[PDB]
Design an enzyme around this catalytic site. Structure first.
Site, PDB file in Angstrom:
ATOM      1  N   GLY A   1    -110.556  66.550  17.786  1.00  0.00           N
ATOM      2  CA  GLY A   1    -110.660  67.845  17.133  1.00  0.00           C
ATOM      3  C   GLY A   1    -110.584  67.703  15.622  1.00  0.00           C
ATOM      4  O   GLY A   1    -111.285  66.881  15.020  1.00  0.00           O
ATOM      5  N   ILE A   2    -109.714  68.490  14.989  1.00  0.00           N
ATOM      6  CA  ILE A   2    -109.654  68.549  13.531  1.00  0.00           C
ATOM      7  C   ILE A   2    -108.439  67.786  13.020  1.00  0.00           C
ATOM      8  O   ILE A   2    -107.910  68.089  11.946  1.00  0.00           O
ATOM      9  CB  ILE A   2    -109.640  70.005  13.028  1.00  0.00           C
ATOM     10  CG1 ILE A   2    -108.404  70.745  13.537  1.00  0.00           C
ATOM     11  CG2 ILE A   2    -110.906  70.730  13.450  1.00  0.00           C
ATOM     12  CD1 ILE A   2    -108.322  72.176  13.064  1.00  0.00           C
ATOM     13  N   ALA A   3    -107.994  66.794  13.789  1.00  0.00           N
ATOM     14  CA  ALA A   3    -106.969  65.847  13.348  1.00  0.00           C
ATOM     15  C   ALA A   3    -105.631  66.536  13.088  1.00  0.00           C
ATOM     16  O   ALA A   3    -104.963  66.271  12.088  1.00  0.00           O
ATOM     17  CB  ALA A   3    -107.426  65.070  12.112  1.00  0.00           C
ATOM     18  N   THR A   4    -105.234  67.428  14.000  1.00  0.00           N
ATOM     19  CA  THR A   4    -103.917  68.048  13.894  1.00  0.00           C
ATOM     20  C   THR A   4    -102.806  67.012  14.002  1.00  0.00           C
ATOM     21  O   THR A   4    -101.795  67.108  13.295  1.00  0.00           O
ATOM     22  CB  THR A   4    -103.751  69.123  14.969  1.00  0.00           C
ATOM     23  OG1 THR A   4    -104.749  70.135  14.794  1.00  0.00           O
ATOM     24  CG2 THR A   4    -102.378  69.765  14.875  1.00  0.00           C
TER      25      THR A   4
ATOM     26  N   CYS B   1    -110.783  72.075  28.167  1.00  0.00           N
ATOM     27  CA  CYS B   1    -110.563  72.834  29.398  1.00  0.00           C
ATOM     28  C   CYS B   1    -111.490  74.050  29.442  1.00  0.00           C
ATOM     29  O   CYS B   1    -111.078  75.208  29.352  1.00  0.00           O
ATOM     30  CB  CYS B   1    -109.099  73.240  29.515  1.00  0.00           C
ATOM     31  SG  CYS B   1    -108.443  74.113  28.074  1.00  0.00           S
TER      32      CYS B   1
ATOM     33  N   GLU C   1    -113.953  61.725  18.164  1.00  0.00           N
ATOM     34  CA  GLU C   1    -114.674  62.989  18.215  1.00  0.00           C
ATOM     35  C   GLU C   1    -116.181  62.759  18.148  1.00  0.00           C
ATOM     36  O   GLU C   1    -116.661  61.837  17.484  1.00  0.00           O
ATOM     37  CB  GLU C   1    -114.229  63.903  17.070  1.00  0.00           C
ATOM     38  CG  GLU C   1    -114.990  65.215  16.963  1.00  0.00           C
ATOM     39  CD  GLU C   1    -114.542  66.248  17.979  1.00  0.00           C
ATOM     40  OE1 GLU C   1    -113.747  65.905  18.878  1.00  0.00           O
ATOM     41  OE2 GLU C   1    -114.985  67.410  17.879  1.00  0.00           O
TER      42      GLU C   1
ATOM     43  N   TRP D   1    -104.649  72.891  18.401  1.00  0.00           N
ATOM     44  CA  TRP D   1    -103.250  72.988  18.782  1.00  0.00           C
ATOM     45  C   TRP D   1    -102.523  73.913  17.809  1.00  0.00           C
ATOM     46  O   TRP D   1    -103.139  74.603  16.993  1.00  0.00           O
ATOM     47  CB  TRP D   1    -102.634  71.594  18.844  1.00  0.00           C
ATOM     48  CG  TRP D   1    -102.998  70.869  20.095  1.00  0.00           C
ATOM     49  CD1 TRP D   1    -103.559  71.408  21.215  1.00  0.00           C
ATOM     50  CD2 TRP D   1    -102.853  69.469  20.353  1.00  0.00           C
ATOM     51  NE1 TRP D   1    -103.760  70.434  22.159  1.00  0.00           N
ATOM     52  CE2 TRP D   1    -103.337  69.235  21.653  1.00  0.00           C
ATOM     53  CE3 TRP D   1    -102.357  68.394  19.613  1.00  0.00           C
ATOM     54  CZ2 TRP D   1    -103.336  67.972  22.230  1.00  0.00           C
ATOM     55  CZ3 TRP D   1    -102.360  67.141  20.188  1.00  0.00           C
ATOM     56  CH2 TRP D   1    -102.846  66.941  21.483  1.00  0.00           C
TER      57      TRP D   1
ATOM     58  N   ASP E   1    -118.646  58.212  21.239  1.00  0.00           N
ATOM     59  CA  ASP E   1    -118.222  58.896  22.456  1.00  0.00           C
ATOM     60  C   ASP E   1    -117.174  58.103  23.226  1.00  0.00           C
ATOM     61  O   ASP E   1    -117.178  56.870  23.230  1.00  0.00           O
ATOM     62  CB  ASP E   1    -119.438  59.153  23.351  1.00  0.00           C
ATOM     63  CG  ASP E   1    -119.224  60.303  24.312  1.00  0.00           C
ATOM     64  OD1 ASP E   1    -118.057  60.682  24.541  1.00  0.00           O
ATOM     65  OD2 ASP E   1    -120.226  60.830  24.840  1.00  0.00           O
ATOM     66  N   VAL E   2    -116.266  58.836  23.874  1.00  0.00           N
ATOM     67  CA  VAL E   2    -115.231  58.208  24.688  1.00  0.00           C
ATOM     68  C   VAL E   2    -115.843  57.553  25.920  1.00  0.00           C
ATOM     69  O   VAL E   2    -115.340  56.538  26.419  1.00  0.00           O
ATOM     70  CB  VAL E   2    -114.151  59.242  25.065  1.00  0.00           C
ATOM     71  CG1 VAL E   2    -114.663  60.223  26.112  1.00  0.00           C
ATOM     72  CG2 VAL E   2    -112.911  58.554  25.563  1.00  0.00           C
TER      73      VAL E   2
END
Ligand SMILES: Nc1ncnc2c1ncn2[C@@H]1O[C@H](CSCC[C@H](N)C(=O)O)[C@@H](O)[C@H]1O
Ligand SMILES: Nc1ncnc2c1ncn2[C@@H]1O[C@H](CSCC[C@H](N)C(=O)O)[C@@H](O)[C@H]1O
Ligand SMILES: Nc1ncnc2c1ncn2[C@@H]1O[C@H](CSCC[C@H](N)C(=O)O)[C@@H](O)[C@H]1O
Ligand SMILES: [Zn+2]
Ligand SMILES: [Zn+2]
Ligand SMILES: [Zn+2]
Ligand SMILES: [Zn+2]
Ligand SMILES: [Zn+2]
Ligand SMILES: [Zn+2]
Ligand SMILES: [Zn+2]
Ligand SMILES: [Zn+2]
Ligand SMILES: [Zn+2]
Ligand SMILES: [Zn+2]
Ligand SMILES: [Zn+2]
Ligand SMILES: [Zn+2]
EC number: 2.1.1.37
Lengths: 432, 127, 438, 407, 378, 24
Positions: free
Chosen positions: C174-177, C242, C196, C419, C218-219
């Site tokens: 995501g945005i590196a929270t 999710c 990401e 998050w 990609d993972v």
């Protein structure tokens, strides 16, 4: 008697006559002024039509017409970096030599005569002092020479009072932004911005210190006395009325150009009455690329001759404009400061490389200005603000995007330019 | 003395002559014609003192009235006063607020702090 | 019907004259043999009804109200509590059959109508509010699972002279929270391998963090060789997208099929990167998922992960309602939530100059009329929150998402699915004793 | 379009390889095992799932040429279930052949009659062995070959310990003692009451049955002895693959343990290409494609993941085999066909159906294997239909005799 | 001994096989028929002394079915002499003679058959699943020709596949003509069993076998060996049993399968073979208890099983569940080889319908035992 | 007692018509 340029070129090539007597591209005799670029003269019609369209530019980032005469029919562009100069097909072969038109079209890449070291190709001898000679053209050439401004008497340090400003078409409150940057204590400020998008910027960023009023259309005479004596009258009218970028091109007497007259009306009202000796000032700002007929009109109505402070000498973008007014020292030598951003590489975020050193003018409408990780990209809103000197994230209010954060930064003033203009006002009003 | 803009056939001069009053000196820019409208400076007004859309003439008229207006504290008689009815409402509000007086009527629109010969004759009656 | 298959009328009559208790009767189902109790009231619940309550309780509609009955599980017609700070909707069939005949007609006409949760408690028929339901609603969710796994082993205390920077592999970054919160506590980050695939989420990590985040592709295209080319990881954070596991989407495919398959990639690379036998280096991990998910998924995810989730709601540290499940072996994942001095427990602390907030808390982020248009007011005019204030609500530094020409929609989307800084700050807080600080 | 490449190759301006066989798009990636030419990547992926899928009547559900069925002509020749695409004919051999083929009776496909240069649809002279080369190894990733276990001496060979998830009817148990290996345990995981009857009565209760797979924990696998072979096959009619992969990790030997461990999976070929790569990526192996037509009298192709020693050897029939249907029939019954796909018999001039005792000898199990628990005709068919095949499994399990105790 | 136990009228005509006393002619006739049949539950239909009652007591002893009446006790009883209910000491071997001892066919068995004679030529009617063929092969007597007249298609298959088609079916018995018998003649064995009022319905078939005897017996002056047989259930009218014995001119025998099997199969036999009246002797390879006729890990709740028919407390338990018998377990009761009905894709219905109405292999094996000394043995 | 009882006895000492024809 409409002699052409070939006879004059033949005469001067044999050392029989001089270049000054002939219009450099019109060919007509009886010259009225010189050419800032090349040695010669310019006729009255050529001077009138070339004062206007010199500083206009196209979207691609090149001049809209010839750099020599005034006109664009077939244009060969210079491909040198940090140079957008375009030449005239007719201009080349008639003055420098035969056969250069087709020869230049084939050599890749092409460099204009300005880029290469000076050589007298035919009769096109460039000036060694054109850099200091172009300025004298725009600053003062018109017929009437108005009297020098009066110099107000000195004031002791302990006899100074806070200034009471009154702005018009305030936009995003640039004058208020610079006033505390200098150090002047603002005792009052009355903006009249009607754009609710811009109003949110002034309230949130300056904490409601702007006693906002409505359009400058319903402010009556009694209002300007209900609010007390005003020691400064800022104002910059919208410049989307008379410009050769829009076909309509309505004059200053029609359309949205009549907002200038509102500034004159308010200046008459706020001006001190006869017999009063309080320090009073004014100012103005409008696009340089305006019709010559109206260029003198603004001068005559305000009884002052405009100056030209060129933004390139202080910023990282090209936009020159006229600054009327009676500020004490609006004709000095422009000097940059230590905390400046002369090159575009200083106005970019992390992991980005600047291909250029200077950027063509920015307007309401938005190729290879920056490459990150081997991929081209365009400028951000975070980057368009550092160019003008605004604090970063200034316009990040009211849920904006590239749609609006670029329109407001496009028709705004320049922080360094006004910071230069308002320097002398530290002596007549409160400091610290 | 009287200053008039858009004299035309000098019908105002004829009306003033028919009123039995004499005019010491009349200055006009179009009888004593001097030059065009755009050829007047502050020094010219001082020497001549005391005393194309519609906007193009309105701006010049407003500038002339502002320049010829007496300074604060003077009590000399200084007055001023035309546009067709059929014209843009925005321009109507422009020239109404600019002159600091709302229009009334007369089909023309007349301002003033005081063509059709009878209207001018009636206006010049109280002079 | 059967003896167990009675109706609520007989149970209410029996409990009316002190002949029985509400415990034996399913409060809306009516059947016998209670297995659990109703968290809000007193009584019992059945399997057919309880498993319908673990999903439908927390989902909300766009307008800002509960999607179903606060009483049974089901919505045919609902009466919303007109009082603010409470979006509970009650069931018409639930009302008249437990408090008395004719209460429905008077409830629909009494203006403003206050729900029985808001009025001071009294024995309204048999709707007796519990005096301690605030602490008993947590017990419905936190521990009623199936296999009762063993307590995780606790790592020994590490000296401050042997503490070393933290290497993080943040699957679905995501945005590196995680990066933002990690050094706020003062922990030195010696490596951070994000994974990401969305380009915008890479711009934030590259710009705001000076290019210290080594992004990879990609993972799904990560082999066993990459996991050893990139050094031994001391933390494997993860959270699945999710969109295929929440019941909110009518066209969901559930686990084992579709987007929900990506949990096993977390499960795969966790074992691929988990220390082998004999390795005693401190290793931690954490999975995160929405509460509103079917119990069939919740049991399988817990069976594979061999741990039981906790339930941390974001109402005790911020000004929003967001509750999620947290799998992991983080030390101290069950301690109660306590706010901090520099928090924003009300909506007024998260506003600009000259803005007035009506409510005190707001519902979750990401038809929505007169309530979504009325969360804040300025100059006596209706307004909606700003992208600048949605970063204060979550605890993100101001102007964090001012990159890459992102309009309103992008800054809303990349923020609403992220998050919450106070929650992850509470979770990460004990890590200061295991890694290098300052 | 289709006529673009046909016109060019006819004038000897290009070859058949340059163009997609029917897609009409250039830049092909894979060659057609059937004919000469190549296939586009868009057409390449769509051909895996539908090649081996058949219909109830006994014909292909798609085109024999490209992938598509809109109008198809069925081949009238027996022992050949290929249906050709209508537009695939006239654009290849010539206009007007579609009407002629439908009008003539009987009609045989271009595959049956000996190969002729019919336009450009020239049958490959080596198609038989180039169909496997398309399936066995075509996926992008190339994982390392498995390590070969050292030879196990006969004096140190121990009884085998099996863990048969999704056991069915104890097919694995029957073959391990038929080959002669000594079984030490067989922990089935079947939860169908009907199937538990067969495995207990016919084997004298040597199967240690357990309950559902979703109730097995890491403690049970620790209590039940160490395992040496983890069989697995999921019901094709994808959730249960991850349960097999879950339990394999518990039973897979830990680092430092040097005991022989083998595993094996099984799935049909009619699955999406995306699922095929996911199963192989998790398992870190590439599959084989063994067909039962070379060992029995029925058609079925099934992928076989695993580390079994020799999953790539060629398929050879055995002496004790029944390659034809007439060898799996009772007395006074005459066979009509030679093979039966996944009117089959006559009786006094009347068409009948294969008996449950005749479907019994085809699969390789001993006769009367399913005559317990009072099953009817329908039940005895369903248990056999979804089971394995002894000759195929005995081929895979054959090399195990050198690792564990025999006799 | 001068009065009937169940009637009370004097002048008795016979004694009682269980207790000392007399039986009147009204009660003895009702005692001949109503004795042996059973109900669906698996108990005696009526009392064991009077064989009558609307409501009767039910016994509960292990492997017992004899149920007593209500009024039968208090009249006469109120082990030892309980009232007058003193049991006979030898009722086990006494009731077997009451039914048996109720002349016969030609009383002289020639014994003239000698060495090197032709093998058996056996003709049957309503054969079913080839019961007679199976037993004949087991003894070892060679068969030259075996004809059958079965009509049900489902049972034709069993004889074909399991015997390689050596049995030549022809047609229903109603189509056989005199010339057919002569063409297929001569014949040495005429087996016949009617499907189970005699002058109406399907029972009329009994005389077809009798007529078949008239077309197969040796002619006058031909002293070649010749035999016959007949089978019928005991649940029939008194006048019906006297007619078959009258036409066949013989004293029929009483044979019950309990002495050789593990099921209650008592049926009625005729014929002229040697040694029919010999007491039944068991074999060492006989399955006599239900605990051995069952599959793996299946324990029985009983010892013997009541009469079994097409229609279905059940005699086995599985893993603590009350459970029933398998189809492959009914075959071992009758002595049939395993999987004898696993043909033609049939389930519980057809196989139960076939095994239920069929004969018993060990029972028929006893009747054909003396035939090994007449024809080509081994 | 139908004709079948006497006919069967008659044969020993010595669809109804179809069986009678086959009886002789
Ligand atoms: N009718 C009106 N009354 C007051 N302001 C107006 C107006 N029409 C346009 N404007 C404002 O005039 C501005 C001109 S752009 C100049 C803004 C100012 N010089 C600065 O500091 O940036 C526009 O932003 C527009 O919002
Ligand atoms: N195949 C994939 N590999 C890695 N990341 C993926 C992916 N597919 C989707 N993603 C990303 O994973 C993210 C999951 S949202 C969860 C991110 C985390 N909770 C946080 O905000 O800090 C999505 O934003 C999506 O962009
Ligand atoms: N949930 C579950 N747990 C354990 N086994 C299951 C199951 N669901 C289905 N099965 C069994 O898995 C089998 C897969 S079909 C394969 C059958 C078996 N391999 C054979 O050779 O016969 C089915 O027979 C089914 O009985
Ligand atoms: Zn000119
Ligand atoms: Zn030119
Ligand atoms: Zn150049
Ligand atoms: Zn319920
Ligand atoms: Zn309800
Ligand atoms: Zn409420
Ligand atoms: Zn294609
Ligand atoms: Zn096709
Ligand atoms: Zn064919
Ligand atoms: Zn009697
Ligand atoms: Zn009795
Ligand atoms: Zn008894």
């Amino acid at each position: 008697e409409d002699q052409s340029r070939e006879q004059m070129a033949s005469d001067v090539a044999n050392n029989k006559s001089s270049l000054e007597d002939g219009c450099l591209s019109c060919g007509r005799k009886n010259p009225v002024s010189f050419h800032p670029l090349f040695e010669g003269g310019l006729c009255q019609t050529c001077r009138d039509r070339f004062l206007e369209l010199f500083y206009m530019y196209d979207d691609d980032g090149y001049q809209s017409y010839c750099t020599v005469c005034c006109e664009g029919r077939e244009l060969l562009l210079c491909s040198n970096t940090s140079c957008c100069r375009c030449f005239c097909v007719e201009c080349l072969e008639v003055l420098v030599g035969t056969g250069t038109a087709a020869e230049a079209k084939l050599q890749e890449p092409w460099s204009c005569y300005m880029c290469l070291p000076q050589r007298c190709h035919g009769v096109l001898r460039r000036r060694k002092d054109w850099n200091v000679r172009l300025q004298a053209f725009f600053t003062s050439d018109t017929g009437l020479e108005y009297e020098a401004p009066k110099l107000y008497p000195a004031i002791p340090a302990a006899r100074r009072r806070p200034i009471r400003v009154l702005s018009l078409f305030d936009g995003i409150a640039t004058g208020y932004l610079v006033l505390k940057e200098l150090g002047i204590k603002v005792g009052k400020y009355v903006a009249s911005e009607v754009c609710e998008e811009s109003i949110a910027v002034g309230t949130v960023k300056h904490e409601g210190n702007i006693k906002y009023v409505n359009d400058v259309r319903n402010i009556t005479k009694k209002n300007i006395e209900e609010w007390g004596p005003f020691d400064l009258v800022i104002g910059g009218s919208p410049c989307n009325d008379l410009s050769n970028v829009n076909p309509a091109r309505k004059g200053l007497y029609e359309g949205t150009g009549r907002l200038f007259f509102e500034f004159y009306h308010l200046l008459n009202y706020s001006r001190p009455k006869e017999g009063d000796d309080r320090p009073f000032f004014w100012m103005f700002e409008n696009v340089v690329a305006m019709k010559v007929g109206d260029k003198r009109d603004i001068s005559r109505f305000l009884e002052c001759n405009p100056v030209m402070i060129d933004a390139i000498k202080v910023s990282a973008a090209h936009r020159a404009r006229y600054f009327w007014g009676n500020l004490p020292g609006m004709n000095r030598p422009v000097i940059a400061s230590k905390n400046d951003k002369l090159e575009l590489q200083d106005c970019l975020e992390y992991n980005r490389i600047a291909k250029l050193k200077k950027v063509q003018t920015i307007t309401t409408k938005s190729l290879f200005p920056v490459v990150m990780n081997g991929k081209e990209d365009v400028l951000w809103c975070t980057e368009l603000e550092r160019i003008f000197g605004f604090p970063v994230h200034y316009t990040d209010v009211s849920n904006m995007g590239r749609g609006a954060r670029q329109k407001l930064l496009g028709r705004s003033w320049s922080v360094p330019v006004i910071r230069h203009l308002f320097a002398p006002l530290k002596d007549y009003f409160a400091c610290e």
